[PDB]
DNA sequence: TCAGTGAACGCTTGTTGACTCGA
DNA sequence: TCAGTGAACGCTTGTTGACTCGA
């Protein structure tokens, strides 16, 4: 229809809340008040929307989903190739951190910060990308000194390490040497295991 | 004097804002109305003591610091023993977390997520015991493979990890064993870097 | 039909000031 | 002398309701 244009205020508020993070406040402390005055509606407008700044954050988590998949199939797709495996998927790790920021820094922020039902939803995301880790390296017999459990143990390392590193790829010894270089001693390790 | 007890309403101001993040809250959400409330004073009276709820940021960073360089120094001792450095090392950690919750509690949410100031003081104590452990490692020769460049990196993946645990460290594939497991396979890296 | 409005609700907020009253 | 008080300041907050007026 033009309920197009419905969304297009449900991209408002949404963005806001993210741009209003950017000054270094958490999610938690965001008034609904503040994020309808940046969006550009009235206070109860809002409603029209969202019952809850809580279910705000909940389509933030969902928004920097989709992102964070289409990056991690691009990656995916590039673990076929014969060498250079880190390199590359950094690389396109990178550029799109880049490309998106807002919505990493949304992910930064609140990882262990928010309400417990936002840290619920960034858990369940976490469970999904090890997840998926663990499946392709098993896949690919990448660590084949390893079994399941510690596939795992492995990939949780993997995850744990990206998403501590958010912040700082967020505003020699430059982000995407040191995360390759980190991401490095982390295979090596995985390879000589036993 | 019995400047002792103004000193205990110090403390109690603290545990009250460490202690009201306990159920998911962020710092920057706590009102300095509901912090005194908590504490057992009148709104006015936190000013006899800190001049903003940021600088009760700053008084939390400080103490974390004393308990976490304390718990350092015990696994620094203990480094010097040959065999078991890393399940030893964990339990002495893990120990100290258990008997200090709260605080590592208020590290482990504020770490990205506060104020910038208070997101400062955490980078510099979290240099501190990245530079402190770069000198350990440089000292006993534990990674004769690595010069100063790579250590700097080594050490900030070990700390990073650290960091990145303690979350799931407050409240088989249980913590210590997996934590162990994973420093595990960071040492291997190292040992075997060439 | 319904996305966005404008007014009005009871309430909590950070900071002021001149105070009390025990160490 | 000064840690803690109690009242009062101007202001922002989340949620209500009955509304307007273009698609
Ligand atoms: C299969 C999708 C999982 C991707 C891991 C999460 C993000 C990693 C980003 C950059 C580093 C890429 C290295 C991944 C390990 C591949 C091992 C070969
Ligand atoms: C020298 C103090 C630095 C301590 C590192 C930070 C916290 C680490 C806690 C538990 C794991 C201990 C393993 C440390 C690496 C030692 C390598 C041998």
Redesign the pocket.
């Known amino acids: 229809?033009?309920?197009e244009?419905?969304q297009?205020?449900?991209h408002?508020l949404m963005s806001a809340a993210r741009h209003l993070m950017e000054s270094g406040r958490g999610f938690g402390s965001?008034?609904?008040?503040?994020?309808?005055?940046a969006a550009?509606?009235?206070?109860?407008?809002?409603?029209?929307?969202f019952?809850?700044?809580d279910q705000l954050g909940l389509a933030l988590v969902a928004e920097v989903d989709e992102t964070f998949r289409a990056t991690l199939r691009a990656v995916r797709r590039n673990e076929f190739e014969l060498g250079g495996l880190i390199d590359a998927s950094v690389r396109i790790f990178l550029d799109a951190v880049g490309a998106n920021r807002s919505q990493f820094l949304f992910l930064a922020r609140e990882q262990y910060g928010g309400s417990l039902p936002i840290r619920q939803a960034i858990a369940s995301l976490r469970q999904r990308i090890t997840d998926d880790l663990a499946a392709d390296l098993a896949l690919l017999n990448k660590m084949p000194h390893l079994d399941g459990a510690a596939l795992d143990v492995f990939a949780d390392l993997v995850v744990k390490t990206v998403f501590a590193t958010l912040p700082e790829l967020i505003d020699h010894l430059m982000p995407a040497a040191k995360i390759t270089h980190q991401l490095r001693f982390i295979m090596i390790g995985g390879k000589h295991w036993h």
Request: hydrophobic share 35%; net charge positive.
């Open positions: 229809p033009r309920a244009q419905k297009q205020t449900r408002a965001l008034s609904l008040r503040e994020v309808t005055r550009g509606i009235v206070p109860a407008g809002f409603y029209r929307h019952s809850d700044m």
